[PDB]
């Protein structure tokens, strides 16, 4: 980046990797049918939505990783916690 280099401190792979990780956190088992299912796609789009929201705060390396990771742990806790009340 000569004069245009905002995103440089983050690679595309980082974002896509984390976004898939976010999706994977929500649903780890890669089902070949569900993979081609719209409902999963909505969730994947939701993960990108998260990426968009984070980006403003994410104006620093540590912030960016922490934002995504923290939410993932939150999400994982939610599932286990609520399922505790099953039956």
């Amino acid at each position: 980046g000569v004069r245009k280099g905002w995103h440089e401190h983050v690679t595309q792979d980082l974002r896509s990797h984390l976004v898939h990780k976010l999706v994977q956190a929500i649903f780890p088992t890669p089902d070949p049918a569900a993979l081609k299912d719209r409902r999963m796609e909505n969730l994947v789009a939701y993960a990108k939505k998260v990426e968009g929201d984070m980006y403003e705060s994410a104006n620093s390396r540590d912030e960016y990783y922490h934002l995504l990771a923290e939410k993932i742990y939150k999400i994982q806790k939610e599932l286990e916690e609520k399922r505790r009340s099953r039956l």
Binding site: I26, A34, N42, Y46, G52, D53, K74, I75, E78
Partner: peptide, 19 residues
């Protein structure tokens, strides 16, 4: 509020699904 935490319905999907 872009939804940093996932709403119930999306979360339900994984709970309802079991390979």
């Amino acid at each position: 509020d872009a939804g940093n935490i996932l709403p119930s319905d999306i979360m339900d999907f994984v709970l309802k699904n079991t390979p």
